[PDB]
Design a binder for these strands. Structure first.
Ligand SMILES: [Mg+2]
Ligand SMILES: [Mg+2]
Length: 820
RNA sequence: GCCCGGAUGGUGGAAUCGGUAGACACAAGGGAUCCCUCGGCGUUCGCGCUGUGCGGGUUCAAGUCCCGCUCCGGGUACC
């Protein structure tokens, strides 16, 4: 062995072994239990950030641990490669988006390798390649024929392609119930986003108006509180009035260049229950796109109605009682909560549910109302007027009929050799590209490209069979691996990507491509990486943000930054730990850290400093501790193997000291296993390993037996540490002369017999307060425990002239003397 | 507003089952890369008092469980 740990001498050698042996490449093997461990695929922006490194370290820890458990593990990697940032960059550089992207892919890929992430590289995908995106093109045309795709003019205002996600709203909603291993926060977020609403539509007569007006409400129980109606600016009635109302016309237009504003239509509606005439306004807070584009305003009870009403001097009216039985104070604001009705005629004293239903029945029966479900979820807009994305496989024939691009004209290849006049898509500015021909007779092909959410909605499934032509998926491959066992990414994608891929999975199931309802069993959302942030105020009053690496802090009595400076000698203020930014200038580059300390150090810190799902505060000094630890592990292994082979261990003959140490070894194995496998508290896992290593370094290494126990302990630690720091462990495994490559060594299992105790610790309380800890035989009787607790001066002096009233005893744990 | 966390040393945090609080690490500081000290106050060095945001409550026993309070963090809404 070499005396120095030198990651530079070890990491690339091990990495190259992994490529040469294709260690992490896997097939669909039915004799083994599968495990699919998936991290969210990176966008090739140019270089990895600390988010990626934390995300992929977590995945890799799991993937490696699961392999050592004897499972067949898929850990795939890929590139979500279309998108906007390349178009602006092709521009700011000489280049085109494709070559820029491929350059970025190559560079980041080399970074992922230097971190020793054990991916199956034979499954690598880059989504901007025809070999990938042809398949979403083919699937689009299929979805079209299914009745799930349509074209529509709509606001953002332009013609767009939509996929009908609303057709699966109730499945997307109900199936949240099957996802116990998704975090609540994410689930709630998809509920809210779907926004399933049970309500009542209520139609009014209007006075000098030859139609009726319908509103949608979720609170029909408050109907008697309705003092006016609000209609969206795009409402037919508001546009009607606006012909003879110059001021209204102004408003139907000020609602584009975008807190309450409105204009009176002049129209009076007739409330159906009261006969009372009420005013219709156009209001800026009424969505034309949801419900009916109009509301019954109840300002006593909805906050937006309240603010609109008191700003335009409209009647506010209380109709729901206070929580406590009393009439409510509406002087400040709307009273929001459901409660008992008053001020509502025949409906007085009814509570929310009984009232909802009484007032709906009555209105249904007068023929001016009906129950109604609405959804906040709108259909998914998939077209972009952008160049860098998959072309949309649709065609307009010269006669005017739209249809899918024919199967023999697929894939519709987007061309990569282009010049950017960076403001028109090269496939738009040249009028030849659009030109094509179907069945003879000329045709114009679509020029919009896919929303980039389109590639990231199905990649996880394509990883199962990435080289399969003949189909989007190989169903036997896909069904072997799916569903994903753990999916690891940020919580920010909750109602975008996390929703699209569930929807797409069900799309693929319904085309007979997969046989399961949901794509992923567990979602783990890893916290943010934060760094320290500093700034000085310049002569001009402007805040200049200084990188904490450039910061020079000065502690105090006890640690505590009391004053800091940069090299220019500016006075810095410390704002704490915060999200990493360009604004705040506090980004840490993982490449610098990987090259400073080695990857194992960087990984070990990332996994140690904080639980997967809590924020992680980057510290250089914590990183350096992780580095020093690896050196202490290296040293111990070196001093040990320097002495050569060991005799076989003899378990029956060990000292009480030797037995205690061996028991710490196997208890650690048990705790580390539980913490990684079941709890997923990787930081406490690592802490147990360190705790154990501190004890090992202090143990004797001279006798045949001491040395054999060390051999065992080291072989166990090196495996336990391997999912976090594979390069150093792979190496030390060899040095210790373990069987084969560490990547296929079995996860250590704790030996039940080694964990048995001969003695135990019993805490003695006197009236509930500790006064001693005693070591008694493991099987001492209660009487023996009381007698020995008594012999302890530390106890016996809280038993002087005072008498034991009763005693509480938990076998082998606690004796509580109640006194006295 | 709403949902969701959290509060324990100088800092980051542990404590799963109510029963040895503060593991592990950093920051120290100090001593000839490591062994050590390290919650606060006092010490005769064995401990003693005190202590997990503030009020209660249950319990022989609360960081842990229940009821208020006060604070902090991060998401999010004219649906
Ligand atoms: Mg934890
Ligand atoms: Mg406990």
């Amino acid at each position: 062995m070499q005396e120095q740990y030198r990651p530079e001498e070890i990491e690339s050698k091990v990495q190259l072994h992994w490529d040469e042996k294709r260690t992490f490449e896997v097939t669909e093997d039915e004799s083994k239990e599968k495990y699919y461990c998936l991290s969210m695929l990176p966008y090739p922006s140019g270089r990895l950030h600390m988010g990626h490194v934390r995300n992929y370290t977590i995945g890799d820890v799991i993937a490696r641990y699961q392999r050592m458990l004897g499972k067949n593990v898929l850990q795939p990697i890929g590139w979500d490669a279309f998108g906007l940032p390349a178009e602006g960059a092709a521009v700011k550089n000489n280049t085109a988006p494709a070559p820029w992207t491929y350059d970025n892919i190559a560079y980041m890929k080399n970074q992922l390798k230097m971190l020793g992430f054990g991916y199956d590289w034979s499954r690598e995908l880059a989504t901007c390649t025809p070999e990938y995106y042809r398949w979403e093109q083919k699937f689009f045309t299929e979805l079209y024929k299914k009745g799930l795709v349509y074209k529509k003019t709509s606001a953002v205002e332009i013609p767009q392609w939509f996929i009908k996600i609303t057709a699966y709203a109730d499945e997307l909603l109900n199936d949240l119930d099957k996802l116990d291993h998704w975090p609540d926060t994410v689930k709630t977020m998809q509920r809210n986003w779907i926004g399933r609403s049970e309500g009542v539509e209520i139609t009014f007569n209007v006075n000098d108006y030859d139609n009726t007006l319908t509103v949608y409400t979720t609170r029909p129980d408050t109907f008697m509180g309705c003092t006016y109606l609000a209609v969206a600016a795009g409402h037919p009635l508001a546009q009607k009035a606006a012909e003879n109302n110059p001021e209204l016309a102004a408003f139907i237009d000020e609602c584009r260049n975008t807190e309450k504003k409105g204009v009176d239509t002049g129209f009076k509606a007739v409330h159906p229950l009261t006969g009372e005439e009420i005013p219709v306004w156009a209001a800026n807070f009424v969505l034309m796109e949801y419900g009916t584009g109009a509301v019954m305003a109840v300002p006593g009870h909805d906050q937006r109605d309240y603010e609109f009403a008191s700003k335009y001097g409209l009647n506010i009216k209380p109709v729901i009682l206070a929580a406590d039985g009393s009439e409510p104070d509406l002087s400040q604001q709307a009273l929001t909560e459901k409660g008992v009705l008053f001020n509502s005629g025949e409906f007085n004293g009814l509570d929310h549910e009984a009232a909802f239903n009484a007032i709906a029945d009555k209105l249904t029966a007068m023929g001016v109302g009906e129950r109604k479900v609405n959804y906040r979820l709108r259909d998914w807009g998939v077209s972009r007027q952008r160049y860098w994305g998959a072309p949309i496989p649709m065609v307009t024939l010269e006669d005017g009929t739209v249809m899918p691009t024919p199967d023999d004209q697929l894939p519709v290849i987007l061309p990569e050799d282009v010049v950017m006049d960076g403001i028109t898509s090269p496939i738009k500015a040249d009028p030849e590209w659009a030109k094509t021909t179907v069945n003879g007779m000329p045709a114009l092909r679509e020029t919009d490209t896919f929303d980039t959410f389109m590639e990231s909605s199905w990649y996880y499934a394509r990883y199962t069979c990435p080289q399969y032509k003949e189909g989007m998926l190989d169903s036997e491959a896909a069904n072997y691996w799916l569903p994903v066992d753990i999916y690891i990414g940020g919580i920010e994608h909750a109602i975008m990507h996390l929703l699209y891929f569930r929807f797409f999975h069900k799309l693929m199931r319904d085309a007979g491509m997969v046989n399961s309802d949901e794509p992923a069993k567990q979602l783990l959302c890893q916290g943010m990486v934060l760094a320290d942030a500093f700034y000085y105020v310049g002569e001009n009053g402007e805040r200049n943000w200084v990188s904490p690496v450039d910061a020079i802090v000065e502690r105090d009595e006890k640690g505590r930054i009391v004053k800091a400076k940069d090299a220019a000698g500016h006075e810095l203020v410390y704002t704490g730990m915060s999200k990493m930014s360009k604004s705040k200038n506090n980004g840490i580059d993982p490449q610098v850290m990987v090259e400073r300390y080695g990857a194992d150090t960087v990984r070990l810190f990332m996994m140690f400093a904080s639980p997967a799902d809590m924020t992680l505060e980057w510290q250089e000094s914590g990183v350096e501790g992780a580095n020093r630890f690896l050196k202490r592990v290296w040293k111990l292994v070196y001093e040990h193997t320097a002495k050569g082979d060991v005799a076989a261990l003899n378990v029956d003959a060990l000292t009480e000291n030797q037995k205690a140490l061996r028991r710490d070894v196997h208890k650690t194995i048990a705790k580390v296993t539980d913490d990684i496998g079941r709890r997923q508290t990787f930081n406490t896992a690592i802490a147990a390993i360190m705790e154990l290593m501190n004890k090992l370094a202090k143990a004797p290494t001279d006798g045949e037996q001491d040395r054999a126990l060390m051999q065992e302990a080291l072989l166990a630690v090196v495996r336990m540490l391997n999912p976090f720091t594979p390069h150093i462990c792979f190496t030390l495994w060899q040095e210790l002369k373990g069987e084969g490559d560490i990547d296929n060594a079995p996860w250590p299992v704790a030996d039940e017999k080694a964990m048995v105790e001969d003695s135990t610790l019993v805490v003695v309380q006197v009236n509930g307060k500790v006064r001693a800890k005693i070591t008694v035989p493991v099987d001492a009787t209660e009487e023996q425990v009381r007698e020995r607790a008594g012999q302890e001066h530390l106890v016996a002096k809280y038993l002087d002239g005072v008498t034991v009233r009763k005693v509480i005893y938990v076998p082998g744990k606690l004796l509580n003397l109640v006194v006295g």
